[PDB]
Design a protein around this ligand. Sequence first.
Ligand SMILES: Nc1nc2c(ncn2[C@@H]2O[C@H](COP(=O)(O)OP(=O)(O)OP(=O)(O)O)[C@@H](O)[C@H]2O)c(=O)[nH]1
Ligand SMILES: [Mg+2]
Lengths: 97, 48, 81, 94, 87, 536, 77, 72, 80, 80
Amino acid sequence: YYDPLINPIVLSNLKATEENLPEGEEEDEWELPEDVRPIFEDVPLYTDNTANGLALLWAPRPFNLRSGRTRRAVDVPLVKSWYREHCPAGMPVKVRV
Amino acid sequence: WFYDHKPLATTRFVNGPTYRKWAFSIPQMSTLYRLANQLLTDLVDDNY
Amino acid sequence: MTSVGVPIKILHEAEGHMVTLETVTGEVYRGKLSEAEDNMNCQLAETVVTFRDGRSHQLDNVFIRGNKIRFMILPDMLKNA
Amino acid sequence: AEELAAKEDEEFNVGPLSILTNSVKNNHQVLINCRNNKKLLGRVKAFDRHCNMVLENVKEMWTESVAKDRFISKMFLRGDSVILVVKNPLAQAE
Amino acid sequence: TISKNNKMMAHLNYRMKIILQDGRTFIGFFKAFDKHMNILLAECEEHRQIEEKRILGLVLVRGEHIVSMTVDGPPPRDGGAGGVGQA
Amino acid sequence: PVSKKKFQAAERFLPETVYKKEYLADLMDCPHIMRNVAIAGHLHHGKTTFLDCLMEQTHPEFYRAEDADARFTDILFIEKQRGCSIKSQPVSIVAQDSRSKSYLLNIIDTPGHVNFSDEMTASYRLADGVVVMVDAHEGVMMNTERAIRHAIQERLAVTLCISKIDRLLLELKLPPADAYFKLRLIIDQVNNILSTFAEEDVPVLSPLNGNVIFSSGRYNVCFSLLSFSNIYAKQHGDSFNSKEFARRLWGDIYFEKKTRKFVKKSPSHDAPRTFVQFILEPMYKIFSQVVGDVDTCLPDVMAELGIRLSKEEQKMNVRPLIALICKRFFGDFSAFVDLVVQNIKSPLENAKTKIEQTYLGPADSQLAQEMQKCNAEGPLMVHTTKNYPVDDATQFHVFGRVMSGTLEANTDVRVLGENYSIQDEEDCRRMTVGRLFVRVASYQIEVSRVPAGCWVLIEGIDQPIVKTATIAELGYEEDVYIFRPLKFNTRSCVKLAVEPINPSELPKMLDGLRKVNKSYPLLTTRVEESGEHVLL
Amino acid sequence: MSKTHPPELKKYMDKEMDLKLNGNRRVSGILRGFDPFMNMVIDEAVEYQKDGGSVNLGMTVIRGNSVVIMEPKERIS
Amino acid sequence: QPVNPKPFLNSLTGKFVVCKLKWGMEYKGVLVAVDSYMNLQLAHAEEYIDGNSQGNLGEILIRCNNVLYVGG
Amino acid sequence: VQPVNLIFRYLQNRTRVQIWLYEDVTHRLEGYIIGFDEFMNVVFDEAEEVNMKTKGRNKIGRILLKGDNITLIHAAQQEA
Amino acid sequence: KLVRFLMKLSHETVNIELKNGTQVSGTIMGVDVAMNTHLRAVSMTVKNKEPVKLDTLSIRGNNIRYIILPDPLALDTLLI
Ligand SMILES: Nc1nc2c(ncn2[C@@H]2O[C@H](COP(=O)(O)OP(=O)(O)OP(=O)(O)O)[C@@H](O)[C@H]2O)c(=O)[nH]1
Ligand SMILES: [Mg+2]
């Protein structure tokens, strides 16, 4: 869906490029055969899982992975993301240090 | 299965009792991504 | 594209090289194969025609119909493609 | 593969090929004129849309001119050589 | 033999002698063919009765003109590996 | 003594390739069947990662990580670390077009940072055309417009690749209809640049004109309207002329299922265009399925596309699975080779244009008349624009384009610098050429001769070559002129003085300054009258 | 039974073409039409006789498989 | 007004025709049947060379490729 | 213009046309086309077999000339 | 179709008359759907030339004019 935080696709003063479409009576009659059909026509463009899948792609690791090796429980440092990034603005000197 | 000892270890989602690999679905991973959210960073990229 | 036999594929790689071809009437045309087709119609640029009596002419372009070609001599390097 | 090799035999009941149809089943000799300017006289025992035939007990004759001939016990003839097939008046139903 | 797809290659890379409908004899290493019986001959030469020889190169023969072809010569040519012990 | 001073990738062996090396070397004789191509664009608009796909297709053993860009042509270790291309690297490969005819493609990857646009100039001097990468998200940016304008000034054939199209699907999540407008506007922005050049007509870019392609290097996607039409043709038994379908797959054309005909006015309130319907929506569905439904859709993806995925390929992560699905469905980037072959001139066709622009000698000198024939049997002229350090940095190899004749290894040649003139002939040397190579970034295919039109990396002549040079035949009697210096796109404003900490080690610094001056085309090293040593 | 793709004669159209036909006839004129069989249409066609005579044919159709060699007198468009 | 080959030959079916072969012999006879590939079967057919009959052949089947033209 | 459209011009005009035969350099048929098919077979009317080496003219009242034998068809002129 | 009779023959000995007048005699080791025929232990008698002896021969099937079949052949069983 076109999120309203995405700016609209417009520029005020571009010339529209010349579309050299086929023209004339002999060419409007050109037909595609009856079996030719878009490569996933009956598949829906999105499912209820699609919005979630799009979210996982930008998730923190491991959540941008759907598969992988297991790790030891000791290897997984549950809090390490917290001190890698800058200390929150209000934390005491005790905590900032 | 969320609170088993070695969850899914016997199922198709992980290789077996040696517990060396896993392969989840998106309903699984997204439910887990939600439950982790209190621990996770909000950052979407390394530019920060 | 859809699969077509190796001789025709090699002919399309003979494009841009010099080739020589003999027509069913016997004339030998040497030239630069500017186009080929899957029916092996051939356009030769820069052509030299040799008649069976051994005379010759230059010709600026020739189109030879595919089912009128007896054989071609391709260039050597196409054995590596 | 073989489906269009079996479906073939419908048209031969009525088309120009009927002279071959009658030549087989009623066993009439046919004087198949061919390219090479040679005549084959024999009983067709099979044929097809392309006009192949298998010939039993064949007499081949041509001019070489002096007449020469050869006798061939059985033959397969590639139909592209067949110009003209004639139910031979010098033979009959058998 | 040839074109029986499990043995498509049955004479590939042999040196073969090709007779065309004009009576020419080509000779060369037969190393590709087509469903139209087109053939590609590497290192090809032509031969005529007197025997007169000429060198052509890599020749593509349109299948329409081929009478027949025959094996003229073999393909060109050049307890496995391992080991554990010492001696 | 074991000073592992490595500063660039180097390959111990030649990698395997799909083509035989001998076929590459033999194609060098035919300038009809080769193209010299720059790849240009803004920073990080997908240039190097696009060349990674062509490398992966032509080199069976080439490894792309599932989660990092290989960047084969970023051979310098600083380029590995900085994550951006800093110096242009050439890559020569044989690649088949949609006809399945092999062409020798000479491609310089170029840096997209504005600062290193001197490397873009040095690459445009070797190329006959340019492919410009324009990020489907960002669109036309500062160095995109600079790369287009500089190409037209240098009289290169401009062609367009709209890269990173997955960013529309996956990050922006634009509906397929709004994706078409985003792509269209990028094409409009580019043609707005070309139409500023009124004085020399530049052919209009549109996918209908066969000179735009769409791509995503991350996911092995690259297509044009014809390569999608050929996918339909292949998939539906070639029951239609794919050229006529391609000709209808862009613009305000709508397909009508009731009538099977194509109409230029919307048959309903929401009818998708032929591009939206036949190209974008299948691309979205290739993604959205594997993104949302990796655990269930994969048999349907395999059944539709006619693809095999093993048990362990079906357990792949979403990014590498979609990339693998696209690699097996779309196959090799014939759509790129079409763009190059049909829209970029051969070195033979571009010969006349290149000598007009780049050669100082009179255009009807016999030597200019010969170079315009791009004659491999003509007199030797070579223009080298770019110097690359050998793996121990003792010396440089010079990279360049043979313009006429054949450059031969272990022969003597007259090398002319940028100061040579018929009046002041002092800037002229006889050098013996060492080995010759076809550079392919991290590795080099050695050759004994390189004919006109090709690119070559040259051993042994680098000492007098400060930046660009002309290498000319010794035997040649008439007046040899040089090729003109590079006319850069920018200036060296930033002035930075240097000074050794030991004044007894000043000779070593001066040797360093000579070397970096060879490396960077637009770097100026002065000595000021004050005695300061200055880099600009 | 086969599938026929248009010849690439498109660049020859409206230039004066020589042709050599079966039987060594030579016909010359403005080529301005073809089909998948390369059935030509030659406009203003002129026959060139075996003796240097010449005959105006006018607008002409040529069945494609009789055409042997097809050869401009003038530069490709 | 068009008069296409199949309607034409159908209108000749069961009537006397002359058929000329590409190699110069001519067969005159009643055209008994034709098919969608234009083979010709004739009855009472007689072969003429240089305008002269050389006798009745009887029923004949002329294979499609041999025919130069056929007509009344 | 296309071949089939051009034959329609001869058919619609009933222009007398001269047909060149395949391989047979010695005879040409002059007549009026009255119909044709996709195989280039021509139902030909008032057909006269011109024998150019004698300029003789036999006459053959309406024939199906098989398209396999057609080399060329052009409008017949006022000369004979 | 009758080509599917010939390829039921294999290891049969035949005389093949090619359209060129070449008589080839030998043993069929296989014949295909185009009746391209592959013979082994072959003798080509090219027209007006002395018979050569050959080990193997592949004849492009359109060159076949006729095959004299072996006289004992059980035609009744193969034409089914
Ligand atoms: N979404 C998406 N990102 C891509 C794609 N291709 C490359 N990237 C990313 O874009 C960034 C730049 O890719 P590069 O290949 O380094 O682009 P580049 O233009 O060569 O960079 P410079 O040459 O230094 O200007 C990297 O983070 C890549 O992961 C793509 O196809 N889709
Ligand atoms: Mg880069």
